Design a protein around this ligand. Sequence first.
Ligand SMILES: O=[N+]([O-])c1ccc(O[C@@H]2O[C@H](CO)[C@@H](O[C@@H]3O[C@H](CO)[C@@H](O)[C@H](O)[C@H]3O)[C@H](O)[C@H]2O)cc1
Ligand SMILES: O=[N+]([O-])c1ccc(O[C@@H]2O[C@H](CO)[C@@H](O[C@@H]3O[C@H](CO)[C@@H](O)[C@H](O)[C@H]3O)[C@H](O)[C@H]2O)cc1
Ligand SMILES: *[C@@H]1O[C@H](CO)[C@@H](O)[C@H](O)[C@H]1NC(C)=O
Ligand SMILES: [Co+2]
Ligand SMILES: [Co+2]
Length: 434
Amino acid sequence: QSACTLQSETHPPLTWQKCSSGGTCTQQTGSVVIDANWRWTHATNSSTNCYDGNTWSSTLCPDNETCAKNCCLDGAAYASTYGVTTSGNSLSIDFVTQSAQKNVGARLYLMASDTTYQEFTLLGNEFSFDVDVSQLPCGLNGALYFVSMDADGGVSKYPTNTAGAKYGTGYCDSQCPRDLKFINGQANVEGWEPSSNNANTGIGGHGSCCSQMDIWEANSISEALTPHPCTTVGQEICEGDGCGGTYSDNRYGGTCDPDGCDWNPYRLGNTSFYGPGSSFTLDTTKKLTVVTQFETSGAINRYYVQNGVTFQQPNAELGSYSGNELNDDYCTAEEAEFGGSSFSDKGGLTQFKKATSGGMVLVMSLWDDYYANMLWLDSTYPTNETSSTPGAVRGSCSTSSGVPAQVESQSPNAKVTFSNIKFGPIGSTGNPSG
Ligand SMILES: O=[N+]([O-])c1ccc(O[C@@H]2O[C@H](CO)[C@@H](O[C@@H]3O[C@H](CO)[C@@H](O)[C@H](O)[C@H]3O)[C@H](O)[C@H]2O)cc1
Ligand SMILES: O=[N+]([O-])c1ccc(O[C@@H]2O[C@H](CO)[C@@H](O[C@@H]3O[C@H](CO)[C@@H](O)[C@H](O)[C@H]3O)[C@H](O)[C@H]2O)cc1
Ligand SMILES: *[C@@H]1O[C@H](CO)[C@@H](O)[C@H](O)[C@H]1NC(C)=O
Ligand SMILES: [Co+2]
Ligand SMILES: [Co+2]
């Protein structure tokens, strides 16, 4: 797609800290950009929509190439349309925003310039952020994560994409998402099927795969840390059901692991660690700090800080594994005890290290789940299982929770706030900000 300018595009500014092994930190100034799927897509020469509701224009978009030629992405009114605001080092995303139309959530990328994404090399480094999840009930997910996207949003590889990172192009993740309207400089109208339960979305014949580090998927009830490897590290198109992921009938596709080696302290047995109020170690009614460290072995370490008190990731015992480091032994014990082979099939932490060794883009989002109601995060899943099934219970939410239309109606003013991002060598991000 190209870019149009009927609506101006001004990326909300966002600062973050780059910290040094020598003990200082230096402020960086970036901005955030909303993903292309949230934008108005219209004809290059008029205001006629190329996509509306969950249907493509059959005349403007008779095939993927003609559609991309005929159509452009336009600018975003971040606050008034999308409920996205920033202030200094803080980013807030509202759940439902009513303007001329209803918007639900957002997916945002951290930019280096107004036309390029910021890249981070995670291996050897740590990433810290503060989060307020107090206004995230059952069924919602405020996510902070990394994906192996191109810094230019795909422009250099696919010159029929001239919109680029400035307009939030080039997304990929371990779900190999097929809901994307543009992939590799072409539309995704071919094979498009509208969602039966979402007036604004559908699933196309192509998806966009790449490695994904889910630092944080969470609400006020549950949180999870999950690396996802793919057989090809970076962005790659996939065809139909070969994509696997949420958007295919068979979740286990050809290249990415859509489940990951997940670590949810509640799921692992510690039901007192994270939740609302003073009965939990971490009180989710209050802001907390989350630090994630990528040691060069390929293992992942985690600690939290709240009100000046520090907590390592809680210990877990699972099969022959015992500890709090997310390492090969944890991931293979998890597959043995909970079931499945997707993570190991796609090459495990060894394959995942190939992604963290290179650059990845920072993503922050807020979403509800039109496929499984977020039950995998915060409830019992599958819902016919009980506490006697290892790993079935992931949080205390009812198995009836998280119906999108219901939570959108009942909790439209839900929101997530991410703030105080700090990145640098392991051991550096707790030092004084600059
Ligand atoms: O009996 N089993 O073997 C079994 C295992 C797992 C089952 O549910 C799957 O659980 C995964 C881990 O919670 C889920 O993966 C998560 O999916 C999210 C949505 O796509 C994604 O954002 C997250 O990163 C990922 O870890 C998966 O969705 C469940 O199907 C069921 C039975
Ligand atoms: O030793 N510490 O590091 C430490 C940190 C935080 C502590 O308490 C928390 O302090 C927060 C900031 O003052 C409080 O949050 C603020 O509460 C206000 C009143 O409700 C509210 O208006 C504001 O928006 C909010 O940020 C929090 O309640 C405290 O628990 C203590 C020690
Ligand atoms: C949960 O984790 C916290 C922090 O490590 C710990 O103090 C507490 O004892 C744990 N509780 C259970 C039931 O494992
Ligand atoms: Co094709
Ligand atoms: Co280690």
